[PDB]
């Protein structure tokens, strides 16, 4: 209804105000020396974590302009974490730097959309000379080392991780779940996974990771959109018998359908989590049958005269486990035929002895590679239940961050990285001083990271920074233990594909905000 | 129940005071070098968005008199935007123009009604001096390039309209689907479309256009008004059965069945949709045939003892697809016969053969038009489904900025085609010095949009808009590029349908406001 | 419940404070250059009207005193637009200058009962005066003019009216539909009206005009009052099928069935309207049965043991289409027989035939006048559905104003008209000077609307009075060119009905207003 609205710097003002809340509850967490939140839980006792994600999730104002601050660097510093499965905080303490100067270079006057270009010019820069510091990871050597170093050096989740990847590639498919006692299991089961994110949250069950979840569930392959729940009953109320868990994969569900099973979910009456198809076009109705003959099971397409009541229960496809993320589900062990599966493969293979292309070459040697090179499982082991979920933890972040140096190698952490690409890049320059100001700030901005460690652990930030910008390569300082030198060979790194993430996305909403002159929202 | 009023200059201002709020809000997003404005969001992360049109359907002040004046150029300038497919900002920062000085003018003691006149002379002088700065625009040379420059510059895009128009001709009918994959695909189906719109909003699902969509629906064809759904019952449950959804065309739907039905397209209980008859009289009656031939089924007219309920599934219409707009709906893919279809334009030009006048001439080779001409179907196609659900916005883009050319021409972009117009009738006068003034005013106004474009650049408007106003043509100021020449040769142009609407919209609502002396609403 | 009460003075300005908010706000229309008002509409954009009726309408102030004031004006403004079908904004404008210099008298210590019969002398005069200046208007010549300029000038129009009234006679029905198309349609179908509203508002449908509406509905004739609705179910629910609305002729509904009604129409559950049989006593009982004739099917009446429930569908009356307003129904297009309505009339002669009285012989061929007079449809024909429904606006506007000539002539409009009786009665007296005052009072605003016009128009009111009170006969001042003249010969006229009903009305609730020494209301 009726709504307020702030203009240029009246409003700007107000975003600041609202992002310093943001960013200053989530940077005292910085590294090792970092301090504690207490965030207070409804009933109970309260929650006390060092961790910035979890800080940043509960933060949320009262002013609604403050909060719009606030909302929006928060909505892309987590983009980063969901790219790299790290570096969050960082891009928000990034963010805080970038705007605090640019804002404040604006009241000095300067233009807006320069600062911008300016700014995004010394990042599109400090990418470039972040690719060149970063150092290579291939041999399962180092595979093997990455994945140990993430994971307080458990030398044990490192070799873990390398066994892995060995069976399935490094752009292979790896699952990690509980193990059945002490000593570790791996091996690979018939199974897939797809860019295909659930059709809603709440689905979630551990919110733990923000996923889903399920056992030995049911999957339903309909080639159509679904926003009528109508069409259900007969193989839905079929699957609140047998207990087990529906999965449903259809073009695409909505309204009515979607929120019907969005409340059900709380309602525990039937737990069913639905996603979109893969792809688009004639391609997804192929890989729509590519998981049905996986897991066993027909699709329901209108094509056919197939109606979603004419369909028992074997036409239904079943799976041991799946998991969907905020945009990746994945099937676990599939019921279909290790002989069925075999034979999909053979046409597959036989159409691209037909292959009048290039690109429908490349799309369909994608389709076998799916559906022919299966999953890794890793089962961790420990002596207890406790030590046990423990390191399934562990293993889980390890095996993210090991996929981050295989894509773009590793450079040095602590937040020396970023510091020593801004070293390089002091004599860049735009086209007028505007824009060389929107340099500078980026480049006085990605210090930010390193300061608010080293301040943390009670130091003096400027004398530690000089140092760091005096030495080359990755010379940092180890913060944990006050010393200089090598930080890749003191094992302080962070995989390149994060940093890279956390100054990208922390630039792109600084520059948004930078650029804004109004906001609306609604009155109080 | 109890109202508040207000009178003369109290309550303009008011007015005034509002639309200010609006005004202001969304024309900080002029030109190329626009600033963002952050458009909170109940619940989840803001919107920040450039998009003039996003930023006024939220604008609503809590003064209820300052509401109606931000409300009442809304509704106006929005109807710029749906006849031109653009324009909406520029209309409003326009009337911002004109009501201001205006207003002033009036507290300056000068008469209401003449600065009126003297706008609207001004306006109707403006209107001709911009079809003679037309430039024409009809060898599919040109539809291929306007259509590119409107989409950053595709030359795919603008090819792919022009083969389209090719096709259907340039009052053919076009539209615009998802591809099936890489590669565009184009060709003509059995369709037609009528200007009628939707019987109400809501029934939209695509606010994205703000329209409706249907996928394989039925048609229901009832020569006859509707306001009981109780007649609906027996061939509308029918239909919640196989899901297709319903399109009703009658010659009206009211209250009762009209509202039951709204309510219902949200509880997700059916979703159809309805709209008016064609054209009235006995011409109405006879073009619901031809969409029912088209659609293959039957009509159902009280004329002959057919009641709704004595009507099957088969006696009902049925199309791949349709589109309903605020004022036009369009079947695309007839199931109709592709021998009965041609039967029927059998008849109607051997109806042109006993053609005893003129008027009943054009009208009924206008319908064989429809009927016979098919609508064209353009089906974007890309690498991924992101990149492909992007492309086809921008050729739904293309596609609107296209049709506008081909009617009326192009003119220079930037504002400048407005500056030029004005500078040409310095020499313009009216029938007293009043009327004078509002010659003056409107003038003085045509320069707003191109001096605020400058002025988000940070430049100088005011040096800028003489050196505009120094050349001749559509020797303009690419504000993108700093460098002034000819506007249409760097590619920023505008449908001189869209600038002349614009202006005829503004100056239509700035008109009726400084003639306004009393406001009536509710008490708060 | 507990009240407040005023007296006297202090009761008297809460009132005229009132009627000034109401006068103040329509007045800025009264003719030509007159200026908007911006009525704000609960959710959507304003509505801007220059329509008097529609702003006095809405206005509703929150003081409870004040509020009367404005409210009384009102009930009495909007009888002159009843009677005339125009000059509310007059009777309005009229009033107010009456009552100010009126109460301003009595403050000056005079008397009220004086002041009013001052005033109603000075009018009773006004009005012969008035009828003096009025020039006839009996050729079709004439009536085809006068419905022509009421009509900015469309002479279709006019003839078209003349057209008609030439079939059914001055004294005859006429009656306005939408069109089949291009080209005006005219004829006379077996109907009938009479002098009853509806029994209710809500029922209309078409606020347009403020009017029912039904399409082939059926008529229900029972001769008794009916307040149970138990009473109705039989034949009502039997009604609910068909979709047939329903129209109830009965001596009265009251209460509960009536409420029942009332209620239903807007829950759209059957939209049926019931009006009074017409007249009383055994007259009543009769031409209920003429009704029942002229649309076949019968009465039922208790005299005879017929119930409302041994009552089955054929029983009940049916007709084309009827149409209620606030004072009278009209049945067009009836199933009755062509044959046995003329054995009806052929009785209702040979009544006359046994005529012992005069009063007698009158109400029976009065009789036979409506029923075997018929009733004249003109069908509105233009290009589009929207010239259309406006065209079809002007004639039934245009229908009306001829009317008013036809019946008492028609005089110099622009507010001349009464001017010019005033200045021709500057000589009359009364009993006593307060008396005196009272004539002086109401001849000094008689000169309000003219005034009022020319202010509107930016000039000067005295000169322009004073030049038109110099002239004599119909010289006035067509405020739209400037020019003085001969109004009717210039074209500004007004049927001398709406004149005489504007000041008539206007000095009655003045009259009353002036005489009020107490107000009583509730307590806020």
Do not use: W
């Amino acid at each position: 209804a009726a709504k307020d609205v702030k203009f240029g710097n009246d409003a700007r003002v107000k975003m600041l105000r609202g992002v310093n809340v943001l960013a200053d509850a989530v940077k005292v967490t910085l590294g090792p020396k970092g301090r504690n939140v207490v965030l207070d839980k409804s009933f109970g006792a309260p929650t006390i974590t060092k961790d910035g994600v979890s800080v940043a999730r509960e933060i949320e104002l009262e002013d609604k302009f403050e909060n719009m601050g606030a909302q929006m660097v928060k909505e892309v510093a987590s983009k980063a974490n969901d790219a790299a499965g790290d570096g969050t905080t960082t891009a928000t303490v990034l963010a805080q730097a970038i705007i605090t100067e640019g804002l404040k270079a604006v009241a000095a006057g300067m233009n807006p959309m320069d600062l911008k270009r300016g700014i995004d010019k010394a990042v599109t820069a400090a990418v470039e000379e972040l690719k060149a510091l970063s150092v290579p990871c291939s041999d399962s050597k180092a595979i093997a080392q990455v994945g140990t170093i993430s994971a307080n050096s458990d030398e044990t989740v490192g070799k873990l991780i390398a066994e892995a990847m060995d069976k399935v590639g490094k752009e292979g498919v790896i699952t990690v779940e509980d193990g059945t006692g002490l000593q570790d299991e791996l091996d690979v089961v018939e199974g897939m996974q797809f860019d295909r994110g659930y059709l809603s949250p709440y689905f979630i069950n551990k919110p733990e990771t923000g996923a889903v979840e399920l056992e030995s569930p049911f999957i339903l392959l309909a080639d159509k959109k679904i926003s009528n729940i109508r069409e259900m009953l007969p193989v839905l109320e079929a699957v609140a018998k047998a207990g087990k868990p529906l999965l449903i994969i259809a073009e695409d569900v909505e309204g009515e359908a979607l929120a019907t099973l969005v409340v059900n979910t709380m309602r525990g009456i039937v737990k069913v989590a639905a996603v979109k198809a893969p792809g688009f076009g004639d391609r997804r109705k192929a890989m729509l049958q590519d998981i049905a003959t996986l897991t066993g099971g027909t699709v329901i397409s209108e094509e056919i005269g197939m109606e979603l009541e004419k369909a028992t229960l074997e036409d239904l496809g079943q799976a041991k486990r799946v998991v969907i993320n905020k945009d990746t589900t994945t099937i676990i062990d599939g019921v279909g035929e290790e002989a069925a599966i075999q034979g999909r493969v053979a046409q597959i293979r036989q159409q691209i002895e037909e292959a009048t292309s290039d690109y429908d070459r490349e799309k369909l040697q994608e389709r076998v590679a799916k559906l022919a090179g299966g999953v890794a499982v890793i089962k961790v082991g420990a002596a207890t239940e406790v030590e046990m979920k423990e390191k399934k933890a562990r293993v889980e972040d390890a095996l993210h961050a090991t996929r981050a140096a295989v894509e773009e190698g590793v450079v040095a952490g602590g937040g020396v990285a970023l510091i020593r690409v801004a070293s390089k890049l002091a004599d860049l320059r735009g086209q007028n001083e505007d824009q060389n100001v929107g340099i500078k700030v980026a480049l006085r901005a990605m210090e930010a990271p390193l300061r608010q460690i080293v301040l943390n652990c009670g130091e003096k930030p400027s004398v530690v920074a000089n140092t760091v910008k005096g030495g080359d390569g990755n010379y940092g300082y180890n913060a944990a233990t006050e010393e200089y030198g090598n930080m890749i060979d003191m094992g302080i790194l962070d995989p390149t594909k994060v940093t890279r993430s956390a100054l990208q996305y922390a630039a792109s909403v600084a520059g948004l905000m930078i650029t804004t002159e109004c906001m609306v929202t609604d009155l109080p």
